[PDB]
Design a protein around this nucleic acid. Structure first.
Ligand SMILES: [Mg+2]
Length: 34
RNA sequence: ACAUUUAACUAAAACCCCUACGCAUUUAUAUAGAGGAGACAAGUAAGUGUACUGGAAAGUGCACUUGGACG
Protein backbone atom coordinates (compact mmCIF):
# COMPACT_ATOMS: atom_id res chain seq x y z
CA UNK A 1 0.00 0.00 0.00
CA UNK A 2 1.17 3.54 -0.68
CA UNK A 3 -0.17 4.82 2.66
CA UNK A 4 -0.80 2.62 5.71
CA UNK A 5 -2.34 4.21 8.83
CA UNK A 6 -0.76 3.44 12.22
CA UNK A 7 -1.15 -0.23 13.13
CA UNK A 8 -2.93 -1.14 16.38
CA UNK A 9 -2.84 -4.72 17.64
CA UNK A 10 -6.07 -5.69 19.42
CA UNK A 11 -6.66 -8.94 21.27
CA UNK A 12 -9.54 -11.10 20.03
CA UNK A 13 -11.78 -12.55 22.74
CA UNK A 14 -14.28 -14.24 20.41
CA UNK A 15 -12.06 -17.29 19.86
CA UNK A 16 -11.52 -18.29 23.49
CA UNK A 17 -15.30 -18.68 23.76
CA UNK A 18 -15.52 -21.36 21.08
CA UNK A 19 -12.32 -23.06 22.28
CA UNK A 20 -13.64 -23.36 25.84
CA UNK A 21 -17.10 -24.42 24.68
CA UNK A 22 -15.60 -27.21 22.58
CA UNK A 23 -13.46 -28.20 25.57
CA UNK A 24 -16.60 -28.47 27.72
CA UNK A 25 -18.76 -30.22 25.10
CA UNK A 26 -16.06 -32.85 24.49
CA UNK A 27 -16.50 -34.25 28.02
CA UNK A 28 -20.07 -33.29 28.88
CA UNK A 29 -22.77 -35.92 29.38
CA UNK A 30 -25.74 -36.12 27.01
CA UNK A 31 -29.04 -37.95 27.09
CA UNK A 32 -29.56 -41.68 26.54
CA UNK A 33 -28.94 -42.36 22.83
CA UNK A 34 -29.53 -38.62 22.26
C1' A B 1 26.06 69.26 -71.03
C1' C B 2 28.09 74.18 -72.29
C1' A B 3 31.82 77.98 -73.43
C1' U B 4 36.07 84.82 -74.99
C1' U B 5 34.31 87.75 -78.55
C1' U B 6 34.73 93.04 -79.31
C1' A B 7 38.05 96.72 -78.15
C1' A B 8 42.73 99.24 -76.76
C1' C B 9 44.88 108.84 -79.05
C1' U B 10 41.86 108.26 -71.58
C1' A B 11 39.61 102.94 -71.24
C1' A B 12 35.86 99.77 -71.43
C1' A B 13 31.78 96.57 -73.57
C1' A B 14 29.63 91.45 -73.50
C1' C B 15 29.01 87.09 -70.26
C1' C B 16 22.49 84.12 -68.05
C1' C B 17 22.92 75.59 -70.06
C1' C B 18 19.52 70.43 -69.12
C1' U B 19 17.31 66.94 -66.40
C1' A B 20 14.00 64.44 -59.94
C1' C B 21 9.27 61.72 -58.50
C1' G B 22 7.06 56.63 -58.91
C1' C B 23 2.77 51.05 -60.60
C1' A B 24 9.16 53.83 -55.72
C1' U B 25 10.01 54.35 -50.12
C1' U B 26 8.21 55.14 -45.14
C1' U B 27 5.33 54.73 -41.56
C1' A B 28 0.79 55.86 -39.82
C1' U B 29 -5.45 56.62 -40.13
C1' A B 30 -10.16 53.98 -40.44
C1' U B 31 -12.83 50.05 -41.20
C1' A B 32 -14.51 42.69 -42.13
C1' G B 33 -13.64 39.69 -38.36
C1' A B 34 -10.94 36.84 -34.53
C1' G B 35 -8.84 36.50 -29.60
C1' G B 36 -7.13 37.94 -24.93
C1' A B 37 -6.51 40.19 -19.77
C1' G B 38 -9.01 43.21 -16.12
C1' A B 39 -13.23 44.98 -13.28
C1' C B 40 -18.28 43.69 -11.36
C1' A B 41 -20.55 39.47 -9.93
C1' A B 42 -20.97 35.38 -7.30
C1' G B 43 -7.68 4.99 -0.79
C1' U B 44 -4.35 6.54 -4.51
C1' A B 45 0.87 12.66 0.03
C1' A B 46 2.39 17.26 -2.52
C1' G B 47 4.97 19.15 -6.83
C1' U B 48 8.65 20.04 -11.59
C1' G B 49 9.45 18.84 -16.84
C1' U B 50 7.59 16.28 -20.98
C1' A B 51 4.17 13.11 -23.67
C1' C B 52 -0.74 10.77 -24.87
C1' U B 53 -6.30 10.46 -24.13
C1' G B 54 -10.43 13.57 -23.28
C1' G B 55 -15.00 18.85 -25.30
C1' A B 56 -13.74 19.86 -20.55
C1' A B 57 -13.31 18.21 -15.48
C1' A B 58 -8.99 15.53 -15.20
C1' G B 59 -6.35 10.66 -15.72
C1' U B 60 -2.11 7.74 -16.98
C1' G B 61 3.23 6.83 -18.51
C1' C B 62 8.92 8.17 -17.67
C1' A B 63 12.60 10.75 -14.88
C1' C B 64 13.47 14.11 -10.88
C1' U B 65 12.46 16.98 -5.75
C1' U B 66 10.75 16.84 -0.06
C1' G B 67 8.92 22.12 0.21
C1' G B 68 5.26 14.67 3.04
C1' A B 69 4.43 9.99 6.25
C1' C B 70 7.20 5.70 8.10
C1' G B 71 6.00 5.03 16.66
MG1 LIG C 1 19.07 15.99 -10.03
Amino acid sequence: LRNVPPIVFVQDKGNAALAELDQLLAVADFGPRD
